[PDB]
Design a protein around this ligand. Structure first.
Ligand SMILES: [Cl-]
Ligand SMILES: [Cl-]
Length: 192
């Protein structure tokens, strides 16, 4: 069938340096996410609405609650722990009016643009492994949720390789951008 089994991260604990890079990427990625949502005509609203394209997380990072910040930090932290777990080493060595009208918070996100940075084929492969792991983490949690509530189904409870590209996009994009951001910030990833 499908038995999601995330990477075993036993013993792996992030030190202050790697917690800091998780924090800095999370803030960067929030601004990249907000920039994309605003480009796609989303606006801030107190309650999330898919139909009305209103999103409560469309605020400056420092106005987010801890739940909101963890939407970024949790999967990023887990992807970094998974990389370490499988033996990789991590060496730290004008304002447009319609853009501004998307929120009442004078928020014009301008994250660093890493579209001109490239990833080796090896790092592209690693981003796919980390995205698959994010999917397995989600799937294991979802199966637990369904089972304790007496059963049920979910259309994305299939192996990562059976998801469509569109289904894979959120996790793939996060890991690709994280690996670019590590590169940008002067980290070197070394294979086992
Ligand atoms: Cl430390
Ligand atoms: Cl923070």
């Amino acid at each position: 069938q499908y038995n999601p089994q995330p990477i075993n991260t036993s013993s792996v604990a992030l030190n202050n340096d790697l917690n800091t890079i998780v924090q800095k990427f999370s803030e960067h990625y929030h601004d990249a996410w907000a920039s994309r949502k605003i480009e796609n005509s989303w606006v801030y609203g107190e309650n999330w609405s898919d139909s009305q394209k209103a999103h409560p997380r469309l605020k400056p990072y420092n106005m987010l609650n801890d739940y909101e910040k963890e939407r970024y930090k949790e999967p990023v932290r887990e992807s970094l722990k998974a990389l370490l777990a499988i033996g990789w080493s991590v060496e730290h060595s004008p304002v447009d009016v319609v853009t501004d009208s998307a929120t009442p918070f004078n928020y014009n996100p301008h994250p660093v643009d890493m579209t001109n940075l490239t990833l080796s084929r090896e790092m592209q492969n690693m981003a796919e492994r980390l995205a698959e792991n994010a999917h397995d983490i989600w799937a294991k949690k979802k199966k637990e949720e369904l089972t304790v509530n007496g059963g049920g189904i979910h259309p994305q409870l299939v192996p990562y390789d059976l998801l469509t590209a569109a289904e894979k996009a959120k996790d793939r994009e996060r890991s690709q951008e994280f690996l670019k951001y590590l590169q940008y910030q002067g980290y070197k990833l070394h294979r086992p």
